[PDB]
Amino acid sequence: FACKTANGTAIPIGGGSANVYVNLAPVVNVGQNLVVDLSTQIFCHNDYPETITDYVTLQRGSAYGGVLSNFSGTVKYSGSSYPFPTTSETPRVVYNSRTDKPWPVALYLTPVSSAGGVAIKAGSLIAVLILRQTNNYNSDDFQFVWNIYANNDVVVPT
């Protein structure tokens, strides 16, 4: 089991860390959602689906920089919505194929009432998402740590 980003960066068997650089809607009003769809950015596969089933959760997700300060967040994992930053590990998604398939994670971030101006800065860390992988075969328990960085400023009109 291993994962890769849209730009080619991979985290191999056993886990590790990688940076993901995302473009963001440049203007988001109070009452609107800024969406960070990582299902188009992060892809993973099972290396031995003939015999092993891989189990994958969002173990936890944290907000940083302007997202922590200026946004109220929810994370969608494989169709279900949870608080972001997270308060519990999600249910498991099954990976049973060698074809790389999306990690079904999306952040929905809406400005807090106090937000205004540049609410997210270009180049800043905005989230860390921990993908946890286990299986039905041995005791493997691996973390794939995704550091999410903003490619551009996000302005909240005032």
Short mmCIF file of N, CA, C and O in Angstrom, two decimals, residues 2 11 16-17 47 49 68 74 81 93 101 107 116 119-120 147 158:
data_model
loop_
_atom_site.label_atom_id
_atom_site.label_comp_id
_atom_site.label_asym_id
_atom_site.label_seq_id
_atom_site.Cartn_x
_atom_site.Cartn_y
_atom_site.Cartn_z
N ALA A 2 0.61 2.15 -0.95
CA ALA A 2 1.37 3.38 -1.10
C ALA A 2 0.47 4.43 -1.75
O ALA A 2 -0.58 4.11 -2.32
N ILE A 11 4.49 8.61 -1.30
CA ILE A 11 4.85 8.08 0.01
C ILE A 11 4.83 6.56 -0.13
O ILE A 11 3.79 6.00 -0.50
N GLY A 16 5.02 7.70 5.74
CA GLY A 16 5.91 8.84 5.68
C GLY A 16 5.11 10.13 5.53
O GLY A 16 3.94 10.18 5.91
N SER A 17 5.75 11.14 4.95
CA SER A 17 5.17 12.47 4.81
C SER A 17 5.39 13.00 3.40
O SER A 17 6.39 12.68 2.75
N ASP A 47 -1.11 -3.05 -2.82
CA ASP A 47 0.01 -3.68 -3.54
C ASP A 47 -0.12 -5.19 -3.65
O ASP A 47 0.65 -5.81 -4.40
N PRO A 49 -3.57 -7.05 -3.66
CA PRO A 49 -5.01 -7.30 -3.50
C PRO A 49 -5.42 -8.74 -3.74
O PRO A 49 -6.54 -9.11 -3.38
N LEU A 68 -7.26 27.92 10.48
CA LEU A 68 -7.58 27.83 11.90
C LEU A 68 -8.19 29.13 12.40
O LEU A 68 -9.17 29.12 13.16
N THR A 74 -15.49 21.73 8.01
CA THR A 74 -15.96 20.36 8.06
C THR A 74 -15.16 19.55 7.05
O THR A 74 -14.70 20.08 6.03
N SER A 81 -19.80 13.65 6.74
CA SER A 81 -19.28 14.93 7.20
C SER A 81 -18.95 14.88 8.68
O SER A 81 -19.70 14.31 9.48
N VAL A 93 -12.12 3.08 4.91
CA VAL A 93 -12.35 2.86 3.48
C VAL A 93 -11.51 1.67 3.07
O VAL A 93 -10.36 1.52 3.51
N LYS A 101 -6.34 4.92 -6.72
CA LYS A 101 -7.65 5.52 -6.65
C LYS A 101 -7.65 6.65 -5.63
O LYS A 101 -6.85 6.65 -4.69
N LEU A 107 -12.26 19.17 2.21
CA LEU A 107 -12.50 20.16 3.24
C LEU A 107 -13.50 21.19 2.73
O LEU A 107 -13.38 21.66 1.59
N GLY A 116 -11.98 38.71 7.44
CA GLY A 116 -12.02 39.76 6.45
C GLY A 116 -10.64 40.00 5.87
O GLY A 116 -9.64 39.87 6.59
N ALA A 119 -7.56 36.13 4.16
CA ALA A 119 -7.87 35.16 5.20
C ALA A 119 -6.97 33.93 5.15
O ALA A 119 -6.77 33.27 6.18
N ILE A 120 -6.44 33.61 3.97
CA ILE A 120 -5.43 32.57 3.78
C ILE A 120 -4.33 33.18 2.92
O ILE A 120 -4.61 33.82 1.90
N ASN A 147 0.89 17.21 4.32
CA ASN A 147 0.99 18.61 4.68
C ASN A 147 0.43 19.45 3.54
O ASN A 147 0.97 19.45 2.43
N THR A 158 -15.00 42.45 2.59
CA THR A 158 -15.52 43.16 3.76
C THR A 158 -16.46 44.29 3.33
O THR A 158 -16.71 44.48 2.13
#
